[PDB]
Design a protein around this ligand. Structure first.
Ligand SMILES: [Zn+2]
Lengths: 331, 336, 336, 335
């Protein structure tokens, strides 16, 4: 299928030679090739899109990115730097590349302000944030976005009417030491990433973010970070036990997945898991994505192009869902 | 279907009135009914079994159980008490009831000794442990069982040739405060349980427990605690990325799921998810279970009995897999 | 789910009551109840709808119906009689009952005129025809509708822009002797029904009916009469072998299923098969239906209401798909 | 996966230039290549097996084959010629190739004798028959094998303990004229094949063949010729309606699929449909197969080798089911 849209596509600042090497050392077998591809915006990246039937990709800042910076001023400075950099880096290819906002999430008002700046000034398609914001004097704290103090931020997101992509980040500090350091090969795609995002996303659900912000659209990669596997189980325990006991979210987990949540196929090129999600989530709420350069185009697009499923859903998941959600023009 | 076998089925010590009521208040809408049912061994429990085509159930000690006890001598004493108590309580119904060992997991050799004692003396069918063992001055530490220092225990498990059921437990201490306190309705079946078990189980994989103990059979509840959903993803990242980078487990994740791991249907009465795991895991490695009394017999068994699937897999998952894995003898309605 | 729409729901003429009761005793286990229910339009039928969350049903003449009548003048008269009869029987319940046209299919122009007559005059929602029209001196010939002489009919269908439901009928005559008489328990739902409809439907595909009439909407019951099972196989052989050899239909089988063909859940209350069709066909092209009174409301609606699938597709299949396809009005009343 | 077993793999008699060309003209786009491949036994065929991780294939006579021959004497002669021919053609590769019996099904006793003869003499692994036997003066009759007169044949099948593969055949005669001639592109894999086999197999079910012959193993190609799609529907109507009305088969349709029936992946390389059949039929009763040369090795084996399913079922379907069902000897890479 031609004209596919992908939206979990990363880039790194070229000056961060060491940080890119460190992250590559955890998640890529060819650090040099990885660095070249995660730094490149318009050369190899578009060549890959042209070979593999991708018409448009929305770019986002590499993880852990700004969420790893626990000094508020330093984090804000990096976010502004990244936003200006990518807006300028993509400007010559408005029909092939868009961008998500990079944000410091230390302060709701500041984050809302920066999102508004780059959405209005640059036409950014939304925000992509790498899970909780590292905070505290030594970076051992975590900022979740499901508390009431974030209403001012979510109100800006819905005012702009753009989606928010809740991307994983690596575990750090005391949490890392107590749970992951002794089983470190599980860090990232294998397990740690999904546990972080699903905890955060279900916090937004049960702490009422989608009740206070009904128009809010949150996107999850990797076919929903475990959640669809337990859709029956979560629904059963929410509706039959936890809600009778005090849980006060207004809707069912299935209603939130029909109105507020999206999942993408990033780094999860599983025909098996996709069919299952056609039932549990539905083709109307599933988006193609790659997770480039951590995943390569050939893996993602060889798989998708070969999918033997009905033409309607292949078109919706491949591009038409994203066209509608991100208000994309002809690209 | 008659003669079904279920094996994530809990009991509590009757003397623990307050602890049982506390746990019941978190996970049951009728705490009084819950307490009565989790205390009962031979009356209502067998009556439910008779009404719902369950021939045999293997009983285990309630969570958090012994893994919540961070004083080693108190933990060992509780484990011995529970094992002696349940062994005596089921003695009249060898054709309907078995038991898993309850263990303090503070010390590998001590756990090995208690397991050998109760398997040999009472004919226990295996061990059921509620995730990590709380330890340290205030119980803020966690003992995982995937390090080599646990070899003496795992070698005892395979010597006895019985499975080990890795059950969840609630998050506690600093982990609870940092991650769960502000989103507490996710504690338990909704999310926290599976995250604990999957972390521990995949730690056993990547830290080589199944390479050092290739005969070891580990059972996971709730259709595998998320893992099958990511089977493709885990396999891809292990084989194509992590192993090139240094991960040295001998087999693929799919091979471990064919040789060492099992999943049960406990608390996951999802036709959708079961059909999915027929592909990712396979009917040979799936066991029926209920999670009684946190779940009720009617929900689990009306669902299972109504499954419109092939007769071979239905019989295997319903009872025949367990009959072989737990070397069960003829039990009530086991034949047909 | 309330307000469901079902559209493979049969009725018979009261004057055939004795004949209806006799046949029901051969193919239904409670023939008296079956006969009473297939004859009833507004009492028990509406009662069942209210008790099982069905807001609207489109009625059709029971099979074999007019397609069993091989005399053209008798067949046309029966079609006219049935249409006038049902229009009058439902007139008091415009928010609960609609109807499909009953047609004699001996002559394309005659069928087109009767379809136009009842769609315009009575607001019928489409046509339901029971597979081929019996013809010939002894009724042993079969009229298929995929030949060029039927273009005049299909152009009227698209002019009116209403769907055509291709319903099965029993095998008759020499075909019945040669293939079915000695294995007669396969007649009907078990096998013969689907084999007839799939032959006719794929004949329309391969003979270009949907190329000449790109707006034509054909509805198939019973989750598509086998076809989705072989979607991969049919596509492979059409695209890679048959088309190179001469097959000249313009689109792929998947394109026709996205643009022209629909399936309903009539008499196929299979979560397994539905889940499979979510992939092969897609929730946008699947419609809930019952096959009453051959199936009962409780079987169909207990199954559908209990489906543990995503809310979007559940609403589409349950009622929203039909609302759009059949141009159903707002229902400013809810009796469920 | 190495050491796969495939068992719906066709060959033709080289002397049959016109019949082979005719059949290929309906079902193959490269007539020259097709003719060369369906005639070759040990050259290109084994090379394909070596390329695609197939250790063993059980060969069978092309459709419609002997079931198209309505003269009993001619039919029997063709069956014997084919059987002797293939046994001799494969004798040099006992580690790569086996064969199914080709039979004339005009007479139960005669078919029984020929099956025993070649199973005993040549070590054939079973029988493969292309649906009903054409009969009658002009070949317009069809012999189904679900009548009581076939008990003597099925008893020999169970005496030998070899499976029976029920393969499709093209529609002919008045049935062809009335139903298929005006929509002829549906003939074969598209539709006509499954309709024939499914009618015949479900005839065996409802007419009690598996009740009189409980050890009988029948194999169906193409993931079961539609039947698994309607398993729920067939079961519902059999158990809740037809049996109360008079259907007298002893077991449910699901029980017959657990005890007597098998399906293969021949010409149905659909991950979707296979996953569905893991539920409706079960990996213990599914066999890998290709339908060569109508299908090519690369299509079937690239698909199977790439299947992202659990290791137990992949090896069972890929080879271990067939190794036990057909009592296969050690073959190339079978371990
Ligand atoms: Zn074949």
């Amino acid at each position: 299928m031609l004209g596919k849209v992908a939206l979990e596509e990363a880039f790194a600042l070229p000056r961060h030679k060491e940080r890119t090497r460190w992250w590559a050392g955890l998640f890529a077998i060819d650090p040099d090739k990885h660095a070249a591809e995660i730094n490149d915006i318009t050369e190899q990246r578009i060549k890959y899109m042209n070979e593999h039937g991708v018409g448009y990709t929305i770019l986002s800042y590499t993880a852990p990115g700004v969420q790893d910076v626990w000094d508020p001023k330093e984090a804000q400075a990096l976010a502004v730097e990244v936003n200006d950099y990518i807006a300028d880096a993509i400007k010559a290819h408005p029909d092939r590349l868009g961008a998500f906002a990079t944000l410091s999430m230390h302060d709701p008002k500041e984050a809302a302000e920066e999102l508004r700046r780059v959405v209005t000034k640059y036409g950014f398609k939304g925000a992509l944030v790498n899970d909780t914001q590292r905070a505290g004097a030594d970076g051992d704290d975590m900022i979740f976005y499901d508390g009431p103090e974030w209403d001012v931020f979510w109100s800006t997101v819905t005012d702009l009417d753009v989606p928010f992509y809740l991307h994983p980040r690596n575990p750090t500090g005391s949490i890392h030491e107590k749970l992951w350091a002794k089983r470190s090969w599980l860090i990232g795609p294998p397990l740690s990433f999904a546990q972080g995002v699903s905890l955060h996303a279900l916090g937004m659900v049960t702490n009422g973010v989608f009740d206070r912000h009904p128009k809010l659209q949150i996107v999850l990669g990797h076919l929903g970070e475990h959640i669809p596997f337990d859709m029956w189980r979560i629904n059963h325990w929410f509706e039959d036990i936890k809600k009778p006991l005090g849980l006060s979210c207004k809707l069912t987990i299935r209603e939130y997945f029909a109105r507020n949540l999206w999942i993408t196929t990033s780094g999860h090129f599983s025909t098996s898991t996709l069919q299952f999600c056609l039932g549990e989530v539905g083709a109307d709420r599933i988006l193609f994505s790659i997770d480039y350069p951590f995943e390569n185009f050939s893996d993602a697009c060889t798989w998708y192009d070969g999918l033997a499923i009905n033409d309607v859903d292949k078109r919706k998941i491949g591009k038409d869902n994203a066209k509608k959600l991100f208000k994309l023009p002809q690209f």
